[PDB]
Design an enzyme around this catalytic site. Structure first.
Site, PDB file in Angstrom:
ATOM      1  N   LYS A  14       0.804  -1.231   0.000  1.00 60.39           N
ATOM      2  CA  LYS A  14       0.000   0.000   0.000  1.00 60.39           C
ATOM      3  C   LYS A  14       0.809   1.239   0.000  1.00 60.39           C
ATOM      4  O   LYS A  14       0.430   2.115  -0.868  1.00 60.39           O
ATOM      5  CB  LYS A  14      -1.011  -0.002   1.204  1.00 60.39           C
ATOM      6  CG  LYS A  14      -2.004  -1.158   1.152  1.00 60.39           C
ATOM      7  CD  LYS A  14      -2.965  -1.150   2.412  1.00 60.39           C
ATOM      8  CE  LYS A  14      -2.343  -1.173   3.780  1.00 60.39           C
ATOM      9  NZ  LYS A  14      -1.593  -2.448   4.013  1.00 60.39           N
ATOM     10  N   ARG A  89      -9.988  -0.699   9.120  1.00 61.40           N
ATOM     11  CA  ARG A  89      -9.424  -2.043   9.430  1.00 61.40           C
ATOM     12  C   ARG A  89     -10.422  -2.922  10.194  1.00 61.40           C
ATOM     13  O   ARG A  89     -10.054  -4.098  10.581  1.00 61.40           O
ATOM     14  CB  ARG A  89      -8.185  -1.833  10.404  1.00 61.40           C
ATOM     15  CG  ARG A  89      -7.050  -1.176   9.723  1.00 61.40           C
ATOM     16  CD  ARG A  89      -6.434  -1.999   8.728  1.00 61.40           C
ATOM     17  NE  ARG A  89      -5.082  -2.527   9.085  1.00 61.40           N
ATOM     18  CZ  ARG A  89      -3.888  -1.955   9.064  1.00 61.40           C
ATOM     19  NH1 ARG A  89      -3.609  -0.642   8.954  1.00 61.40           N
ATOM     20  NH2 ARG A  89      -2.892  -2.780   9.369  1.00 61.40           N
ATOM     21  N   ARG A 128      12.206  -5.692   5.761  1.00 58.98           N
ATOM     22  CA  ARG A 128      12.284  -4.232   5.610  1.00 58.98           C
ATOM     23  C   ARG A 128      13.289  -3.671   6.633  1.00 58.98           C
ATOM     24  O   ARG A 128      13.389  -4.167   7.771  1.00 58.98           O
ATOM     25  CB  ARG A 128      10.866  -3.628   5.896  1.00 58.98           C
ATOM     26  CG  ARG A 128      10.877  -2.093   5.961  1.00 58.98           C
ATOM     27  CD  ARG A 128       9.507  -1.474   5.780  1.00 58.98           C
ATOM     28  NE  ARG A 128       8.551  -1.968   6.790  1.00 58.98           N
ATOM     29  CZ  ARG A 128       7.238  -1.858   6.678  1.00 58.98           C
ATOM     30  NH1 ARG A 128       6.702  -1.204   5.632  1.00 58.98           N
ATOM     31  NH2 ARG A 128       6.456  -2.392   7.628  1.00 58.98           N
ATOM     32  N   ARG A 161      12.110  -2.123  12.184  1.00 57.98           N
ATOM     33  CA  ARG A 161      11.050  -1.447  12.943  1.00 57.98           C
ATOM     34  C   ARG A 161      10.519  -2.458  13.992  1.00 57.98           C
ATOM     35  O   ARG A 161      10.556  -3.698  13.824  1.00 57.98           O
ATOM     36  CB  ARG A 161       9.913  -0.997  11.953  1.00 57.98           C
ATOM     37  CG  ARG A 161       9.210   0.310  12.045  1.00 57.98           C
ATOM     38  CD  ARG A 161       8.341   0.256  10.758  1.00 57.98           C
ATOM     39  NE  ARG A 161       7.080  -0.518  10.872  1.00 57.98           N
ATOM     40  CZ  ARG A 161       5.978  -0.185  10.156  1.00 57.98           C
ATOM     41  NH1 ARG A 161       6.140   0.773   9.251  1.00 57.98           N
ATOM     42  NH2 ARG A 161       4.770  -0.854  10.172  1.00 57.98           N
ATOM     43  N   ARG A 172       0.396  -9.424  13.528  1.00 58.59           N
ATOM     44  CA  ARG A 172      -0.288  -8.451  12.634  1.00 58.59           C
ATOM     45  C   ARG A 172      -1.105  -9.181  11.555  1.00 58.59           C
ATOM     46  O   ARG A 172      -2.173  -8.750  11.190  1.00 58.59           O
ATOM     47  CB  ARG A 172       0.758  -7.511  11.904  1.00 58.59           C
ATOM     48  CG  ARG A 172       1.353  -6.571  12.878  1.00 58.59           C
ATOM     49  CD  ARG A 172       2.693  -5.967  12.332  1.00 58.59           C
ATOM     50  NE  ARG A 172       2.423  -5.131  11.164  1.00 58.59           N
ATOM     51  CZ  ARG A 172       3.411  -4.604  10.441  1.00 58.59           C
ATOM     52  NH1 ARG A 172       4.691  -4.918  10.649  1.00 58.59           N
ATOM     53  NH2 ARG A 172       3.037  -3.756   9.419  1.00 58.59           N
TER      54      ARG A 172
HETATM   55  N1  LIG Z   1       5.721  -5.337  -5.295  1.00 59.96           N
HETATM   56  C1  LIG Z   1       6.654  -5.535  -4.347  1.00 59.96           C
HETATM   57  N2  LIG Z   1       7.601  -6.438  -4.393  1.00 59.96           N
HETATM   58  C2  LIG Z   1       8.555  -6.670  -3.430  1.00 59.96           C
HETATM   59  N3  LIG Z   1       8.673  -5.914  -2.326  1.00 59.96           N
HETATM   60  C3  LIG Z   1       7.762  -4.931  -2.222  1.00 59.96           C
HETATM   61  C4  LIG Z   1       6.725  -4.709  -3.193  1.00 59.96           C
HETATM   62  N4  LIG Z   1       5.999  -3.653  -2.801  1.00 59.96           N
HETATM   63  C5  LIG Z   1       6.480  -3.315  -1.576  1.00 59.96           C
HETATM   64  N5  LIG Z   1       7.570  -4.068  -1.240  1.00 59.96           N
HETATM   65  C6  LIG Z   1       8.459  -3.992  -0.032  1.00 59.96           C
HETATM   66  O1  LIG Z   1       7.590  -4.618   1.003  1.00 59.96           O
HETATM   67  C7  LIG Z   1       7.679  -3.801   2.204  1.00 59.96           C
HETATM   68  C8  LIG Z   1       6.260  -3.284   2.585  1.00 59.96           C
HETATM   69  O2  LIG Z   1       5.854  -2.398   1.563  1.00 59.96           O
HETATM   70  P1  LIG Z   1       4.798  -1.267   1.998  1.00 59.96           P
HETATM   71  O3  LIG Z   1       4.516  -0.510   0.674  1.00 59.96           O
HETATM   72  O4  LIG Z   1       5.202  -0.505   3.144  1.00 59.96           O
HETATM   73  O5  LIG Z   1       3.486  -2.145   2.514  1.00 59.96           O
HETATM   74  P2  LIG Z   1       2.182  -1.669   3.225  1.00 59.96           P
HETATM   75  O6  LIG Z   1       0.875  -2.383   2.710  1.00 59.96           O
HETATM   76  O7  LIG Z   1       2.091  -0.157   3.182  1.00 59.96           O
HETATM   77  O8  LIG Z   1       2.456  -2.271   4.655  1.00 59.96           O
HETATM   78  P3  LIG Z   1       2.831  -1.677   6.101  1.00 59.96           P
HETATM   79  O9  LIG Z   1       3.751  -2.411   7.046  1.00 59.96           O
HETATM   80  O10 LIG Z   1       2.618  -0.192   6.260  1.00 59.96           O
HETATM   81  O11 LIG Z   1       1.630  -2.316   6.690  1.00 59.96           O
HETATM   82  P4  LIG Z   1       0.408  -1.805   7.570  1.00 59.96           P
HETATM   83  O12 LIG Z   1      -0.523  -1.490   6.417  1.00 59.96           O
HETATM   84  O13 LIG Z   1       0.335  -2.968   8.519  1.00 59.96           O
HETATM   85  O14 LIG Z   1       0.929  -0.508   8.460  1.00 59.96           O
HETATM   86  P5  LIG Z   1       0.003   0.676   8.992  1.00 59.96           P
HETATM   87  O15 LIG Z   1       1.121   1.720   8.976  1.00 59.96           O
HETATM   88  O16 LIG Z   1      -1.257   0.881   8.230  1.00 59.96           O
HETATM   89  O17 LIG Z   1      -0.203   0.226  10.534  1.00 59.96           O
HETATM   90  C9  LIG Z   1       0.810  -0.008  11.529  1.00 59.96           C
HETATM   91  C10 LIG Z   1       0.061  -0.180  12.845  1.00 59.96           C
HETATM   92  O18 LIG Z   1      -0.650   1.046  13.175  1.00 59.96           O
HETATM   93  C11 LIG Z   1      -1.895   0.704  13.833  1.00 59.96           C
HETATM   94  N6  LIG Z   1      -2.984   1.091  12.913  1.00 59.96           N
HETATM   95  C12 LIG Z   1      -2.840   1.626  11.649  1.00 59.96           C
HETATM   96  N7  LIG Z   1      -4.029   1.876  11.126  1.00 59.96           N
HETATM   97  C13 LIG Z   1      -4.982   1.449  12.069  1.00 59.96           C
HETATM   98  C14 LIG Z   1      -6.456   1.394  11.990  1.00 59.96           C
HETATM   99  N8  LIG Z   1      -7.191   1.838  10.965  1.00 59.96           N
HETATM  100  N9  LIG Z   1      -7.000   0.946  13.146  1.00 59.96           N
HETATM  101  C15 LIG Z   1      -6.275   0.554  14.198  1.00 59.96           C
HETATM  102  N10 LIG Z   1      -4.949   0.542  14.268  1.00 59.96           N
HETATM  103  C16 LIG Z   1      -4.285   0.937  13.190  1.00 59.96           C
HETATM  104  C17 LIG Z   1      -1.819  -0.809  14.045  1.00 59.96           C
HETATM  105  O19 LIG Z   1      -1.097  -1.004  15.270  1.00 59.96           O
HETATM  106  C18 LIG Z   1      -0.994  -1.246  12.854  1.00 59.96           C
HETATM  107  O20 LIG Z   1      -0.468  -2.528  13.043  1.00 59.96           O
HETATM  108  C19 LIG Z   1       8.746  -2.713   1.980  1.00 59.96           C
HETATM  109  O21 LIG Z   1      10.040  -3.154   2.451  1.00 59.96           O
HETATM  110  C20 LIG Z   1       8.680  -2.573   0.465  1.00 59.96           C
HETATM  111  O22 LIG Z   1       9.975  -2.137  -0.020  1.00 59.96           O
END
Ligand SMILES: Nc1ncnc2c1ncn2[C@@H]1O[C@H](COP(=O)(O)OP(=O)(O)OP(=O)(O)OP(=O)(O)OP(=O)(O)OC[C@H]2O[C@@H](n3cnc4c(N)ncnc43)[C@H](O)[C@@H]2O)[C@@H](O)[C@H]1O
Ligand SMILES: [Zn+2]
Length: 218
Positions: A14, A89, A128, A161, A172
């Site tokens: 994402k 979520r 990562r 991280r 997660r």
């Molecule tokens: N095509 C490809 N091929 C190969 N490699 C690739 C690729 N595309 C990408 N990659 C690599 O893969 C990796 C990931 O890519 P990346 O693009 O960062 O993936 P992502 O889907 O954005 O994943 P995240 O870890 O941000 O996941 P998340 O959605 O769990 O985090 P959030 O910040 O929302 O949430 C974090 C925490 O915040 C809290 N939180 C956030 N939102 C909420 C909500 N709505 N409600 C409650 N708690 C929440 C929770 O505690 C949650 O766990 C990178 O190293 C990238 O280089």
């Protein structure tokens, strides 16, 4: 100027796709993970409480998360369009977002779900690394630094991280896979869901999203 939600399990890509979409289309990126990380870096009470959820791989409670999203979507930029990432979520968050957007007269145009199998997600998250100086993202397989352990830009030391270690990644995945089918159903029943294969080069994943947005441009 569309209203887009990016859906995907943790690690699906994402954030990577959102940077490409904001680059090209100019709509604001609204990431709940970035808002909680901003609050944590500022050491606000909410940011420090959110850290307990983030480091254990669990969801921050619905009521406070809805409140922050509601406040951010109320700003003048979001009247043009937005790219939501990481919200909703839970089905309660998605129902809250429907009421917020109904009040704004801004229905969602697409929910773009990026599909990646959990075995690949575990490798995406655990490999990562982040720069401790500038926050740039690296991936030990897919986007490695020039030198191991060190940021190409500034010499900063890279780290994993707190929530990207394997134990936290497993939690997660469990916690978000539980919510995935009810949220996909919610939006497929609204006729806004598009599924995209995320297990490909980022440029190929981006092209399949872009071709949808370009249809609206034309
Ligand atoms: N095509 C490809 N091929 C190969 N490699 C690739 C690729 N595309 C990408 N990659 C690599 O893969 C990796 C990931 O890519 P990346 O693009 O960062 O993936 P992502 O889907 O954005 O994943 P995240 O870890 O941000 O996941 P998340 O959605 O769990 O985090 P959030 O910040 O929302 O949430 C974090 C925490 O915040 C809290 N939180 C956030 N939102 C909420 C909500 N709505 N409600 C409650 N708690 C929440 C929770 O505690 C949650 O766990 C990178 O190293 C990238 O280089
Ligand atoms: Zn750096």
């Amino acid at each position: 100027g569309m209203n887009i939600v990016l859906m995907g399990l943790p690690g699906a890509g994402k954030g990577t796709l959102a940077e490409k979409i904001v680059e090209k289309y100019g709509i604001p990126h609204i990431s709940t993970g970035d808002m909680f990380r901003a609050a944590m870096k500022e050491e606000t009470p909410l940011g420090l409480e959110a850290k307990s959820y983030i480091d254990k791989g669990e969801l921050v409670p619905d009521e406070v998360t809805i409140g922050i999203v509601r406040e951010r979507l109320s700003k003048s930029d979001c009247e043009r369009g937005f790219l939501l990432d990481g919200f909703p979520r839970t089905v309660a968050q998605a129902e809250a977002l429907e009421e917020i957007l109904e009040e704004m007269g801004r229905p969602i145009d697409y929910v773009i779900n990026i599909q990646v199998r959990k075995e690949e997600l575990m490798e995406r998250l655990t490999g990562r690394r982040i720069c401790s100086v500038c926050g740039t993202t690296y991936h030990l397989v897919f986007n490695p630094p020039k030198t191991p352990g060190i940021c190409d830009k500034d010499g900063g030391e890279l780290y994993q991280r707190a929530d990207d270690n394997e134990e936290t990644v497993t939690k997660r995945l469990e916690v978000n896979m539980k919510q995935m089918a009810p949220l996909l159903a919610f939006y497929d029943s609204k006729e806004v869901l598009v599924n995209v294969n995320g297990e490909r080069d980022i440029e190929d994943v981006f092209a399949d999203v872009d071709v949808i947005l370009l249809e609206h441009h034309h």
